[PDB]
Every structure is written in C-alpha cells, then in structure tokens.
Amino acid sequence: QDLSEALKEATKEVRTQAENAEFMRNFQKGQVTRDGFKLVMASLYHIYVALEEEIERNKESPVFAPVYFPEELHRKAALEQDLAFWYGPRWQEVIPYTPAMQRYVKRLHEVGRTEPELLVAHAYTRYLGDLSGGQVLKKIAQKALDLPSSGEGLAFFTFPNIASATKFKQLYRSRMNSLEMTPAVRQRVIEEAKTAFLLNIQLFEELQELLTH
Numbered sequence: 001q002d003l004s005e006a007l008k009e010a011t012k013e014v015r016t017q018a019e020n021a022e023f024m025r026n027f028q029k030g031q032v033t034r035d036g037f038k039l040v041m042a043s044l045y046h047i048y049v050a051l052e053e054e055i056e057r058n059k060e061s062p063v064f065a066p067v068y069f070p071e072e073l074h075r076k077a078a079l080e081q082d083l084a085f086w087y088g089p090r091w092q093e094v095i096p097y098t099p100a101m102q103r104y105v106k107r108l109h110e111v112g113r114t115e116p117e118l119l120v121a122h123a124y125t126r127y128l129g130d131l132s133g134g135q136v137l138k139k140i141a142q143k144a145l146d147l148p149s150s151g152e153g154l155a156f157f158t159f160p161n162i163a164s165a166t167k168f169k170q171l172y173r174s175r176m177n178s179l180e181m182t183p184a185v186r187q188r189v190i191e192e193a194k195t196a197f198l199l200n201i202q203l204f205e206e207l208q209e210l211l212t213h
C-alpha cells in the first residue's frame, strides 16, 4: 500500500542476494582486509558524489523535494575525510575507479538527468541501508582493521546530524509516502530500487574478483 511498504516487500529477495554476495558475507563475519575496505570506501565516494550531485540538481522538483534532507544525510564530506586517511593527501588522484563503480555512477546520472522521478529509489536504498547497518559494520571494521589511534578513517559510519536512526527512518518513510506519482511511475520507482540492489551486487562481485583473482 504505502510506497515504503511496497519498496521493502519488492526488494526483499535482491536484498538477501546482496547480503549473500561473498564479499559482504565475509565482511559480516569479520573477514575484511585493509585492501578490501579501501576499495569499498572508494566505491561509496564515487557513488555518493554522483547521487548527491543529482539530489542537488533536483532538490526543488516536486518529485524529490519532500525527501530532501541535506544536513541529516549528506555523506560526501565524511567520505572525503576518510579517504584522506586511507589513501593520504593525494587520495583524489590515486583512488581507483573500476567498471562496476562507473556503472553505478552512470545510472545515477541518467536517473538524475532524464528520470528524476526515480531518484528516490536510489536515495532510499543508499541512505537507509547505510544508516541502518553502519553501527554494526563500524564495530566489525574497527576490530578487523586495527586502526592507529589517530581519530579518523570511519566517519562514514556516523551520521552526526541524526540523533536517532529509528525516528529519522520513520520521518523519511512518511515523506516518501507523500510523494505523488502516476501508476506507471510508481512501478518504475519500485523497479529502480531493484536495479540499485543489483548495481550493489555487481559491485561486490567485482571487488571480490579484484581481491582474489
């Protein structure tokens, strides 16, 4: 009935697939290396750059404005901070940009440029996924990666302008459900959420091959 309910129900299978991807399965059980973690952070930076650029283009359109929460959710700055730590001061020149990263980025710019009504599917997937699992993954990461005590490297995993992830997720759902769209568009939003999960699955499959070939 509600768009948030329909999204959750329709992507339950691809979401399990994403969790079952070998790279994530290993991450979840504390088997993650510095080389692997670095690759995922670089991935998220490219992804969020593109997403946030497209949110900014579309923030005033009726098809996104109601789910526009810049202060609460923006992740580009946090990833800039972490990548300076993980790759050093010239991080922006040396971070990798792989085919599977580019495929995600390319879709995000297509959506933002020609089908901005679908941007909510991508925002939902990324922001709510990352908000929800960040506390759990952070702990796993700090145990597995044995950071120096230098106060940096994992800013991505804290959304400082959200005091309660639960309360924020309720508001965000409420705002999603207030978006107005034709039936054809609503179908395409749901499909786009599935596409977002598939773009993540393909990313994880690539990172595993790069790490183990």
Ligand SMILES: C=CC1=C(C)/C(=C/c2[nH]c(/C=C3N=C(/C=C4\NC(=O)C(C)=C4C=C)C(C)=C\3CCC(=O)O)c(CCC(=O)O)c2C)NC1=O
Binding pocket: 004, 007, 008, 015, 018, 019, 024, 124, 125, 126, 128, 129, 130, 132, 133, 134, 136, 137, 197, 200
């Ligand atoms: C990457 C690691 C990752 C972990 C461990 C994670 C866990 C996680 N995701 C959740 C919600 C969510 N998680 C996602 C997304 C994902 N969930 C995924 O495991 C993956 C790979 C995606 C997307 C690529 C979304 C879209 C929601 C909101 C579901 C909703 O309430 O509608 C919740 C809230 C409770 C639940 O629904 O089970 C947890 C604990 N999310 C993550 O993103």
